[PDB]
Design a protein around this motif. Structure first.
Motif, PDB file in Angstrom:
ATOM      1  N   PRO A 191      23.866  17.338  44.667  1.00 49.45           N
ATOM      2  CA  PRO A 191      24.738  16.215  45.020  1.00 49.45           C
ATOM      3  C   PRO A 191      25.020  15.276  43.848  1.00 49.45           C
ATOM      4  CG  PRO A 191      22.533  15.832  45.846  1.00 49.45           C
ATOM      5  CD  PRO A 191      22.590  17.273  45.412  1.00 49.45           C
ATOM      6  N   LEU A 192      24.065  15.160  42.918  1.00 46.53           N
ATOM      7  CA  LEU A 192      24.252  14.301  41.734  1.00 46.53           C
ATOM      8  C   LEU A 192      25.331  14.867  40.842  1.00 46.53           C
ATOM      9  CD1 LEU A 192      20.738  13.221  40.490  1.00 46.53           C
ATOM     10  CD2 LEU A 192      22.597  11.789  41.461  1.00 46.53           C
ATOM     11  N   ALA A 193      25.252  16.170  40.594  1.00 45.49           N
ATOM     12  CA  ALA A 193      26.230  16.842  39.759  1.00 45.49           C
ATOM     13  C   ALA A 193      27.609  16.744  40.416  1.00 45.49           C
ATOM     14  CB  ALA A 193      25.837  18.304  39.554  1.00 45.49           C
ATOM     15  N   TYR A 226      27.854  11.020  27.883  1.00 40.70           N
ATOM     16  CA  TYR A 226      27.316   9.785  28.470  1.00 40.70           C
ATOM     17  C   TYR A 226      25.886   9.947  29.002  1.00 40.70           C
ATOM     18  CZ  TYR A 226      31.947   7.619  28.086  1.00 40.70           C
ATOM     19  OH  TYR A 226      33.141   7.142  27.601  1.00 40.70           O
ATOM     20  N   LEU A 227      25.533  11.160  29.420  1.00 37.65           N
ATOM     21  CA  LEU A 227      24.171  11.407  29.899  1.00 37.65           C
ATOM     22  C   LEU A 227      23.211  11.380  28.693  1.00 37.65           C
ATOM     23  CD1 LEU A 227      24.668  14.115  32.659  1.00 37.65           C
ATOM     24  CD2 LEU A 227      24.693  11.644  32.861  1.00 37.65           C
ATOM     25  N   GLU A 228      23.730  11.746  27.520  1.00 34.47           N
ATOM     26  CA  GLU A 228      22.945  11.723  26.298  1.00 34.47           C
ATOM     27  C   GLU A 228      22.702  10.255  25.945  1.00 34.47           C
ATOM     28  OE1 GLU A 228      25.300  13.843  23.412  1.00 34.47           O
ATOM     29  OE2 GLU A 228      24.908  15.800  24.325  1.00 34.47           O
ATOM     30  N   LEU A 263      16.265  19.108  29.536  1.00 36.91           N
ATOM     31  CA  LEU A 263      16.293  20.080  30.635  1.00 36.91           C
ATOM     32  C   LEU A 263      17.253  19.576  31.724  1.00 36.91           C
ATOM     33  CD1 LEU A 263      15.178  22.467  32.385  1.00 36.91           C
ATOM     34  CD2 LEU A 263      13.257  20.994  32.999  1.00 36.91           C
ATOM     35  N   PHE A 264      17.113  18.305  32.083  1.00 34.21           N
ATOM     36  CA  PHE A 264      17.962  17.666  33.082  1.00 34.21           C
ATOM     37  C   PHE A 264      19.455  17.789  32.714  1.00 34.21           C
ATOM     38  CE2 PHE A 264      19.358  14.691  36.222  1.00 34.21           C
ATOM     39  CZ  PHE A 264      20.144  13.723  35.626  1.00 34.21           C
ATOM     40  N   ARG A 265      19.806  17.414  31.482  1.00 30.07           N
ATOM     41  CA  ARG A 265      21.185  17.494  31.005  1.00 30.07           C
ATOM     42  C   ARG A 265      21.714  18.927  30.966  1.00 30.07           C
ATOM     43  NH1 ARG A 265      19.134  14.163  27.052  1.00 30.07           N
ATOM     44  NH2 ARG A 265      19.681  15.596  25.347  1.00 30.07           N
ATOM     45  N   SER A 272      28.840  14.427  42.619  1.00 32.43           N
ATOM     46  CA  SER A 272      29.420  13.091  42.570  1.00 32.43           C
ATOM     47  C   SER A 272      29.787  12.638  41.158  1.00 32.43           C
ATOM     48  CB  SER A 272      28.496  12.071  43.229  1.00 32.43           C
ATOM     49  OG  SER A 272      27.308  11.930  42.478  1.00 32.43           O
ATOM     50  N   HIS A 273      28.955  12.990  40.179  1.00 33.57           N
ATOM     51  CA  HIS A 273      29.218  12.602  38.795  1.00 33.57           C
ATOM     52  C   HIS A 273      30.327  13.412  38.108  1.00 33.57           C
ATOM     53  CE1 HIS A 273      25.834  10.104  39.667  1.00 33.57           C
ATOM     54  NE2 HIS A 273      25.968   9.479  38.508  1.00 33.57           N
ATOM     55  N   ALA A 274      30.554  14.639  38.569  1.00 35.35           N
ATOM     56  CA  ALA A 274      31.615  15.479  38.019  1.00 35.35           C
ATOM     57  C   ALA A 274      32.963  15.204  38.693  1.00 35.35           C
ATOM     58  CB  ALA A 274      31.271  16.963  38.174  1.00 35.35           C
TER      59      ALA A 274
HETATM   60 XE   LIG Z   1      23.816  12.498  36.862  1.00 36.11          XE
END
Ligand SMILES: [Xe]
Ligand code: HEM
Ligand SMILES: [Xe]
Ligand SMILES: [Xe]
Ligand SMILES: [Xe]
Length: 154
Positions: free
Chosen positions: A89-91, A104-106, A138-140, A93-95
């Motif tokens: 769900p995070l991917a 930006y995640l970096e 790993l998350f990114r 909504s953010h995409a």
């Molecule tokens: Xe995210």
């Protein structure tokens, strides 16, 4: 990539200290992000209006969001790599809704590391920072893979 149990231990040990003050850490991180990379602020129609660090610190709305961000991240880190369900769900909504580029995640990863380094020097030596960096990488990497499946990857 895969982290060793030893690396997860370093990550969860400093995270336990972060959880003693979630709201304060959330505020520090978001402000650091907005000061270091002003362009990121433009993604938040909710906070675009904030002009100075003083206004940011005073925003109750910004502090609430920092808590939401850290709570979501904390739940992911505690899964120790088994976060497939939490990432979806995070991917999405953010995409699709927010349109947040990997770049930006970096920037926020950098902000997280800076804040932990300043507030927890004794629990965030070189080895601990390297483990946190691996966890965020790993998350990114997994989020980027998801972005691609969703038709965004950028
Ligand atoms: Xe995210
Ligand atoms: C550590 C990475 C991050 C985590 C864990 C995270 C988590 C969240 C969560 C839980 C929400 C609420 C539910 C949702 O919309 O999915 C949210 C909303 C949002 N996120 Fe993130 N986020 C992260 C990074 C970012 C970054 C880097 C940006 C942009 C520079 C961003 C922009 C937004 C925006 C625009 C919203 C909606 C805010 C609102 O109007 O309520 N996020 N994020
Ligand atoms: Xe945050
Ligand atoms: Xe991240
Ligand atoms: Xe992660």
């Amino acid at each position: 990539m895969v982290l060793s149990e030893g690396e997860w231990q370093l990550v969860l040990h400093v995270w336990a200290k972060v959880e003693a003050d979630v709201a304060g850490h959330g505020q520090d991180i978001l402000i650091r992000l907005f000061k270091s990379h002003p362009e990121t602020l433009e993604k938040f129609d909710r906070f675009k209006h904030l002009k100075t660090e003083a206004e940011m610190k005073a925003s109750e709305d910004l502090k609430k969001h920092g808590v939401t961000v850290l709570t979501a991240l904390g739940a992911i880190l505690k899964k120790k790599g088994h976060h497939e369900a939490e990432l979806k769900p995070l991917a999405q909504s953010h995409a699709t809704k927010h349109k947040i580029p990997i770049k930006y995640l970096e920037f926020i990863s950098e902000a997280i590391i800076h804040v932990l380094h300043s507030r927890h020097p004794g629990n965030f030596g070189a080895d601990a920072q390297g483990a946190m960096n691996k966890a965020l990488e790993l998350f990114r990497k997994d989020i980027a893979a998801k972005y691609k499946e969703l038709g965004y990857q950028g």
